[PDB]
Design a protein around this ligand. Structure first.
Ligand SMILES: Nc1ncnc2c1ncn2[C@@H]1O[C@H](COP(=O)(O)O)[C@@H](O)[C@H]1O
Ligand SMILES: [Mg+2]
Length: 241
């Protein structure tokens, strides 16, 4: 997939799954095309669905927030499947923590910036872009050798994400999402990526608030972390219809 594997593997737990209908699931985020395609090819090719979705009950509604699993959800619906193996979490428990994923690329800075500016974004050279972005003052900081501020909020975050999605589909960049910006910096020094986009993470209150209004975030906005990762499950794709 598009995400960088964590440098430390947290403990696994054999939590088991329950089938939940895909049309009872509510997205809070947009999709990355390469992440969707990779899941569809993996599950159809292998015949096995091995990672349960993470869900939480939406307050006041007979629906579940997709905590983690937007591409599995979209991909399965696209394939015509009806349900997915799921884990129902207590969203406001202190055992659900939320951070973010940082978009990153190996590719030409100048072509990326040009495409961002063509979409109407401002990309302003700014040595304090990173800390502005961590404070939530700008949409993203574009940081590597150079440092740029991208002003705005959610709409600009969507615009940025869309440019990267398109450039990724066109083969002009390799698009990778990092859980930790320090991992991105380490890979920069190895030459494995050139630039990373820094953003402040949402809070759990903001996520549910946003979903209750029927809105979505830009892709990979939340990185939810539990005290464990569920163990691999062994569900046939045919069992999801
Ligand atoms: N055959 C498969 N069954 C279940 N999950 C998969 C499969 N192949 C890839 N994935 C995962 O599907 C997820 C795609 O993104 P998302 O569903 O949005 O979390 C990633 O966590 C991948 O690790
Ligand atoms: Mg995921």
């Amino acid at each position: 997939g598009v995400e960088k594997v964590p440098k430390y593997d947290i403990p696994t737990k054999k939590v088991d799954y329950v089938f939940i209908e895909l049309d009872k699931m509510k997205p809070h985020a947009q999709l990355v095309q390469k992440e969707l395609e990779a899941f569809i090819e993996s599950v159809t090719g292998s015949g096995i669905f091995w990672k349960p979705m993470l869900l939480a009950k939406v307050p006041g509604e007979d629906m579940y927030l997709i905590v983690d699993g937007h591409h599995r959800w979209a991909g399965l619906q696209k394939l015509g499947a009806k349900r997915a193996p799921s884990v129902i979490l207590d969203y406001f428990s202190d055992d659900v923590k939320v951070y973010t994923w940082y978009p990153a690329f190996k590719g030409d800075l100048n072509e990326v910036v040009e495409r961002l500016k063509k979409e109407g974004l401002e990309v302003i050279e700014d040595p304090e872009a990173e800390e502005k972005a961590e404070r939530g003052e700008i949409a993203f900081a574009l940081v590597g050798e150079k440092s740029f501020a991208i002003p705005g909020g959610l709409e600009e975050q969507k615009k940025v994400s869309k440019v990267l999605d398109e450039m990724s589909v066109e083969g002009k960049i390799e698009l990778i999402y990092y859980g930790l910006k320090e991992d991105a910096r380490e890979d920069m020094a190895k030459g494995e990526i050139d630039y990373v986009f820094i953003r402040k993470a949402p809070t759990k209150e903001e996520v549910m608030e946003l979903v209750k209004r029927g809105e979505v975030y830009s892709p990979k906005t939340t990185r939810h972390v539990l005290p464990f990762n569920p163990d691999k499950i062994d569900v046939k794709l045919e069992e999801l219809f």
